C-alpha cells in the first residue's frame with residue numbers, strides 16, 4: 001500500500017463513520033471513482049463539522065485556504081493548514097478529474113453562516129441553504145459520476161443534492177433543535193401554526209405532522225423527478241446513485257414509523273440497505 005492510498009483510506013474511514021448510508025452506496029463504485037468520492041466527502045465533512053460540532057472558523061479558514069492552494073497550484077507540494085491527508089487525496093483527485101472549486105467555496109460560505117444562525121423567513125431561503133450545503137456537493141461529484149458533464153447532468157446532481165438535504169433536515173428536527181437551530185421557515189412555521197420548542201415538549205400533533213408532510217411532499221416529488229433523469233449519470237453510477245437516493249429517501253418512512261420523533265435520530269438498518277440494494281440490482 002502506497003502512502004497516497006493511506007490518505008484515501010483515511011477519507012474512507014471518515015465517510016464510513018459519518019454516513020453509513022452513502023458509504024454503503026458509493027463503495028460499490030469502481031476504485032478510481034470511490035476514491036474520489038471518499039476524498040470529496042471527507043473534505044465536505046471537515047467543513048460541515050468544523051462548524052456544526054467544533055464551531056471553529058479558524059479551521060474553516062485553514063481548509064478554505066488549503067483548497068484555494070490546490071486550485072491555484074494543482075501540481076506543487078503544499079503544507080496544508082487543516083488536515084494533510086484529506087487535502088493530499090483531494091489534490092490527487094484534482095490532478096485527474098475536473099473539480100468545481102467554486103462549489104466547495106459555496107459550501108464554505110454556507111457553513112460559515114451557520115455560525116451566527118438566523119432562521120429563514122421563507123422556504124426560498126431554506127431552499128437556497130439546501131443548495132449551498134448539498135446541491136453544490138452534487139455539482140462537485142458530477143464529473144466523477146458522469147461522462148457528460150453537461151448542464152443537464154449538473155442540474156440533476158444538484159437537485160438530487162438539494163432533495164437529499166431536505167430529507168436530512170426532515171430527520172434532524174430534534175437534533176437541530178437541541179443545537180438551537182430550526183430550518184423550517186417562519187413563514188411556513190406560522191402558516192401551520194406550529195412551534196418547535198412546544199412540539200419538542202408535549203410531542204407531535206397534527207399541525208406539525210402536516211407541516212412535516214408538506215416538506216416531505218416536496219422532497220419526494222423532486223426525488224421522483226431525478227430518478228426519471230438518472231441516466232444522465234454513468235451506467236455504473238446509475239444503480240449506485242439510485243441506491244444512495246432510495247437508501248436515503250427511506251428515512252422518511254422511518255421518521256413516520258417512529259411517529260415523527262423529536263428525540264431520536266431514526267436510521268435505516270444495514271439489513272434494509274441490503275434489501276433495497278436487492279430491489280434495485282434486479283432492475284440492473
Ligand SMILES: O=P(O)(O)[C@@H](CCCc1cccc(Oc2ccccc2)c1)S(=O)(=O)O
Pocket residue numbers: 022037040041044045048052133134137168169172
Ligand atoms: O446540513 P447538515 O445537517 O449539517 C448535514 C451535512 C451537510 C454537509 C455535508 C456533510 C458531509 C457530506 C456532504 O456531502 C456529501 C454527501 C454524499 C457524498 C459525499 C458528500 C455534505 S448532516 O446532518 O449530515 O451533518
Ligand SMILES: [Mg+2]
Pocket residue numbers: 048049052
Ligand atoms: Mg452538520
Ligand SMILES: [Mg+2]
Pocket residue numbers: 168169172
Ligand atoms: Mg442534519
